[PDB]
Write a structure and sequence with these properties.
This protein is mostly helical. The chain has one helix and no strands. The N and C termini lie far apart (54 Å). Integrin alpha-X/beta-2 is a receptor for fibrinogen. It recognizes the sequence G-P-R in fibrinogen. It mediates cell-cell interaction during inflammatory responses. It is especially important in monocyte adhesion and chemotaxis.
């Protein structure tokens, strides 16, 4: 609509945005397992 001609990609931002949740959730789970979030020193 507006100078929305950046094309406010529906495919790239929505598709990319998911990748953020892709990487984030996956990384967080790995860290938990290795006990990283188990935070040392108890």
């Amino acid at each position: 609509g507006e100078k929305y001609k950046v094309h406010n990609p529906t495919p790239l931002i929505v598709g990319s945005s998911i990748g953020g949740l892709l990487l984030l959730a996956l990384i967080t789970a790995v860290l938990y397992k290795v006990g990283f979030f188990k935070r040392q020193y108890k």
